[PDB]
Amino acid sequence: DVSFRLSGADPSSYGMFIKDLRNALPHTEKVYNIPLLLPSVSGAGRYLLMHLFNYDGNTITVAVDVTNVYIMGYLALTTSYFFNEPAADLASQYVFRSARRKITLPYSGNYERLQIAAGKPREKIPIGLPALDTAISTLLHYDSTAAAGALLVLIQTTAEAARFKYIEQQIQERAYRDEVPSSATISLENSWSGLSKQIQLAQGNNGVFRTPTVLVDSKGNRVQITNVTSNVVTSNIQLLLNTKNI
Numbered sequence: 001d002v003s004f005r006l007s008g009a010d011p012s013s014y015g016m017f018i019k020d021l022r023n024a025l026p027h028t029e030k031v032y033n034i035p036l037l038l039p040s041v042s043g044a045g046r047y048l049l050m051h052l053f054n055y056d057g058n059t060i061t062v063a064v065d066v067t068n069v070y071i072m073g074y075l076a077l078t079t080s081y082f083f084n085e086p087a088a089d090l091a092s093q094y095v096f097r098s099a100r101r102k103i104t105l106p107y108s109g110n111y112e113r114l115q116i117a118a119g120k121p122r123e124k125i126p127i128g129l130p131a132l133d134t135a136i137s138t139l140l141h142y143d144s145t146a147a148a149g150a151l152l153v154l155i156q157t158t159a160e161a162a163r164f165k166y167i168e169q170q171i172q173e174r175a176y177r178d179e180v181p182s183s184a185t186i187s188l189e190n191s192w193s194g195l196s197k198q199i200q201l202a203q204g205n206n207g208v209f210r211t212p213t214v215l216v217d218s219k220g221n222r223v224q225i226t227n228v229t230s231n232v233v234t235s236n237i238q239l240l241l242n243t244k245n246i
């Protein structure tokens with residue numbers, strides 16, 4: 001299990017949490033020095049439990065699939081909550097079994113469905129450590145519309161930060177003040193599967209992408225990523241989705 005406490009949190013302690021999160025994900029192989037997530041894991045070992053504490057010390061436990069960093073559901077007091085998707089239902093067979101009741105959320109976990117439920121794209125949802133504190137508090141008491149927005153915050157400040165050093169740094173900059181994610185942040189989130197695939201395809205292609213990946217940079221300009229010498233590959237991406245899962 002990994003843990004993060006919003007009470008007394010700073011860029012340093014958040015950085016430690018993201019390191020812990022990355023380190024809790026198993027790999028037997030690195031591709032271009034980037035850990036390669038496993039094709040599959042059987043049993044309860046497939047799921048990592050993140051213990052998150054809001055400023056007041058109230059807690060949720062979040063279940064994360066270690067093969068893809070997808071949040072499947074969470075526990076809030078004695079109630080478990082899972083996304084409306086087969087992978088999450090499967091997760092409910094292994095985690096939070098001692099919960100008194102189980103609620104299935106009226107949406108899947110994908111960005112498009114969550115944005116519809118929340119009533120706004122994540123371009124317009126501020127993120128940061130204060131937003132994460134809010135998200136935790138929101139998830140403690142069931143409200144499906146509010147929960148959609150909270151989950152959009154949660155996914156980006158945990159899973160996406162684990163996947164990209166740039167996103168981790170973005171959240172560290174937002175330690176005491178929320179701000180909507182940069183277009184670069186959104187771009188990286190959307191391209192994680194694509195980048196993971198192409199980095200793996202580069203293995204037998206002299207470090208060259210079979211298909212170029214289009215990203216928006218920090219300055220806000222659209223750039224093409226064609227090979228492994230790109231800063232996105234050498235410095236940014238921290239975890240690779242296995243091509244068996246793409």
Ligand SMILES: *[C@@H]1O[C@H](CO)[C@@H](O[C@@H]2O[C@H](CO)[C@@H](O)[C@H](O)[C@H]2NC(C)=O)[C@H](O)[C@H]1NC(C)=O
Pocket residue numbers: 208226227228229230231
């Ligand atoms: C591999 O990727 C790099 C980009 O990371 C490519 O180089 C850039 O491409 C041209 C010059 O060739 C310039 O417009 C850019 O300024 C370069 N960027 C950087 C950061 O140097 C390179 O062309 C690619 N190589 C192959 C074989 O595809």
Ligand SMILES: CCCCCCCCCC[C@@H](O)[C@@H](CCCCCC)C(=O)O
Pocket residue numbers: 069070071072083085087108109110111112155159160
């Ligand atoms: C893709 C259609 C159904 C969703 C399948 C699993 C995705 C939900 C699992 C958690 C998810 O929110 C991920 C990030 C979202 C990626 C989906 C956007 C298209 C996560 O928890 O980081």
